């Protein structure tokens, strides 16, 4: 055991030296002369009410109009953002809901929680209602994130050291990824859906190849649990929000961290991270009931979105990039334009 | 607006009405989170995946959850139980060997950043077993807890002294950690006690009474 530990330490030292040998200058030095971004003021265009309990997750959908939101009341609602109308309100078997996902085609919606089961609901039914299509069971631990590759394949992240890919038809795990040490808290699919990343409760974000089911790289720059991850729109970088009140930007091509977004007035951890259409405004939701907008190329703080009376649990940006929807623990969703 | 938009608005209004009715129906049941150890016997305190137990006392419905089948690290799913009425905490008192661990657990769940508003209802089970061990046998709390030697009482006096010492040890952490946001409710229950439901009912009654008093700024 001692020989293996020594070999692992030597390999880690070699990896660190190789990473250091390829860091000519920080991205901050490169973009020091870049023209800055003025203060951004976004007002609450819409307020969506009717959950009566803490909201835990939300997802927009391929079109930038419909939305889905999951709360601990025991219901999963679908909103028409342009008119604040409720398209659907699906009751759930278990009231402990931790995640929700909207299919790219809009046909199905997935949800999960403490029941260690991913429930998939079919929206467009001949009977005229919403009924449970599938109940993918396993994972021996609570679900924390679900993402749809297409109408037949899903990816789930659980509360153990395991992510999985499910064939919705058969219901069996086509592939399982086991490289983590703590709970996997978030998930983000690549734009081409050939890779993804997973941030775990051990200060580690791992890059998984969705085909062979093996870990490609691991990034360790944080000091506490990672609560949210998100890909850069280009697909060659991503950003992680952790519990040490600090966001970070990692690069796939050169496996290092480029910039860190943190301020001395912030002491509470991040619960949600999203980008902009151009990949310049990093929107991060904090535990101090606020959200912050970071200049992703200069690490500045270009604006504060303060309209919530409790924790900002979920935060997403539409594909069109015309809105930012933040859902908080006070049973309220707000759209900012 | 249009012909197909007023109908959508009416459908949304019906959805809102159904949601409000469901929320009103589900707001009348009090939710309690059950916590404890393997030897604490937390499964059997009230006479009749996640275990769920529904009972009724004085025309009030109580729903009790017992989260099993999950990993040891519980610092991430414990934030789900942030809106519960109370945290029932079952602790075995007849096993001093693992009493300190129980204390640690209590402290950990008492100072949590999210469980500050939730009040804890203690349940020191196996009081008869503790009395039997205190009466006969050579197993003194002095070696496990050095402070029991100098403790005096504020059944024979030995059992009462031990019971009050354990209750004081559990209540000290409850006392020096809050500013009236939540309270501890130490109870002594045997393995065949039948009044646990009434105790939970009364404690929930005054927990929500203190909540109501605090919100109207009356206290």
């Amino acid at each position: 055991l001692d020989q293996l530990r020594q070999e692992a330490e030597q390999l880690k030292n070699q990896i660190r030296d190789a990473r250091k040998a390829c860091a000519d200058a920080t991205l901050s030095q490169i973009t020091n002369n870049i023209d800055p971004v003025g203060r951004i003021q976004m007002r609450t265009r819409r307020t969506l009410r009717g959950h009566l309990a803490k909201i835990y997750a939300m997802h927009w959908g391929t079109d930038s109009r419909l939305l889905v939101s999951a709360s601990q009341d025991g219901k999963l609602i679908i909103w028409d953002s342009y008119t604040t109308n409720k398209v659907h309100a699906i009751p759930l078997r278990s009231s402990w809901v931790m995640t929700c996902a909207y299919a790219p085609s809009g046909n199905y919606v997935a949800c999960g929680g403490l029941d260690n089961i991913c429930s998939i609901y079919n929206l467009k039914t001949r009977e005229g209602n919403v009924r449970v299509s599938r109940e993918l069971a396993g994972h021996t631990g609570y679900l924390s994130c679900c993402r749809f590759l297409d109408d037949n394949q899903i990816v789930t992240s659980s509360g153990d050291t395991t992510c999985a890919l499910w064939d919705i038809e058969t219901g069996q795990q086509t592939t399982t990824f086991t490289g983590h040490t703590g709970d996997v808290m978030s998930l983000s699919l690549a734009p081409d859906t050939r890779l993804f990343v997973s941030g775990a409760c051990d200060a580690s974000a791992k890059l998984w190849d969705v085909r062979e089911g093996m870990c490609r790289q691991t990034f360790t720059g944080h000091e506490s649990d990672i609560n949210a991850i998100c890909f850069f729109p280009n697909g060659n970088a991503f950003a992680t929000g952790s519990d040490d009140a600090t966001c970070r930007l990692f690069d796939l091509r050169a496996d290092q961290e480029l910039m860190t977004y943190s301020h001395d007035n912030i002491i509470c951890g991040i619960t949600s991270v999203s980008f902009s259409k151009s990949g310049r405004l990093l929107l991060a939701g904090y535990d101090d009931f606020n959200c912050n907008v970071w200049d992703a190329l200069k690490a500045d703080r270009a604006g504060v979105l303060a309209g919530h009376d409790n924790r900002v649990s979920c935060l997403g940006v539409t594909d069109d990039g015309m809105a930012v929807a933040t859902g908080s623990w006070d049973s309220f969703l707000k759209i900012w334009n | 607006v249009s012909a197909e938009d007023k109908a959508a608005a009416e459908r949304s209004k019906m959805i809102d009405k159904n949601l409000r009715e469901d929320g009103e129906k589900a707001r009348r049941t009090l939710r309690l989170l059950l916590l404890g150890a393997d030897n604490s016997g937390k499964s059997t305190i009230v006479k009749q995946g996640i275990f769920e137990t529904k009972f009724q006392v004085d025309k009030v419905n109580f729903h009790m959850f017992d989260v099993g089948g999950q990993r040891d690290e519980r610092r991430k799913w414990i934030q789900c139980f942030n809106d519960v009425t109370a945290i029932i905490f079952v602790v075995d008192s007849s096993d001093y060997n693992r009493l300190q661990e129980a204390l640690n657990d209590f402290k950990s769940i008492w100072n949590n950043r999210w469980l500050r508003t939730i009040s804890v209802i203690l349940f020191l089970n196996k009081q008869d077993l503790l009395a039997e061990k205190v009466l006969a046998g050579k197993s003194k709390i002095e070696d496990y807890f050095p402070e029991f030697a100098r403790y005096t009482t504020p059944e024979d006096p030995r059992v009462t002294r031990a019971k009050y010492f354990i209750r004081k040890e559990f209540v000290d952490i409850s006392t020096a950690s809050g500013d009236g946001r939540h309270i501890c409710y130490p109870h002594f229950t045997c393995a065949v006690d039948t009044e646990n439901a009434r105790r939970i009912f009364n404690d929930c009654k005054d927990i929500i009474l203190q909540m109501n008093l605090k919100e109207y700024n009356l206290v």
Epitope: S224 | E73, R74, N104, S108, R113
Partner: nanobody, 128 residues
Framework: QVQLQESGGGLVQPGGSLRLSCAAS????????MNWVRQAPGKGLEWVSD????????SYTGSVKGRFTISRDNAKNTLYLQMNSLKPEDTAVYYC?????????????????????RGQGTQVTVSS
């Protein structure tokens, strides 16, 4: 990167004194509580000692209260625990653990089986 390395364990006859040092690295030492835990041979993990961010609040377990001492050096990021009167019962593998989050007064899963932020441990044996 959040590795913690302990040193100082060895063979000590009963009544002897020992000093264990945990050299934290990869994080800001001044923001997190620090704990000392131990695992007996063929037993579960037992939390031994606590400490606060600056040392204002210090707590001990009942068994070793008044016999051990704990200090936290911040100029050089280290956590020291000194045992004065060792006993045959105080033989175990000692670990140096850290609270999950900064600026927080509670350490939730420090004594759990697999904890992400914990050391490899040093073995101390008493009376051979």
């Amino acid at each position: 990167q959040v590795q913690l390395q302990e040193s100082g364990g060895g063979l000590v006859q009963p009544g002897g004194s020992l000093r264990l040092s945990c050299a934290a690295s990869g994080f800001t030492f001044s923001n997190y509580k620090m704990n000392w835990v131990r695992q007996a041979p063929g037993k579960g993990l037992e939390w031994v000692s606590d400490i606060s961010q600056s040392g204002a609040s210090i707590s001990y377990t009942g068994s070793v209260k008044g016999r051990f001492t704990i200090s936290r050096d911040n100029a050089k990021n280290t956590l020291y625990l000194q045992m004065n009167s060792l006993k045959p019962e105080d033989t175990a593998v000692y670990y140096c653990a850290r609270c999950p989050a900064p600026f927080t007064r509670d350490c939730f899963d420090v004594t759990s089986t697999t904890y992400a932020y914990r050391g490899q441990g040093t073995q101390v044996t008493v009376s051979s």
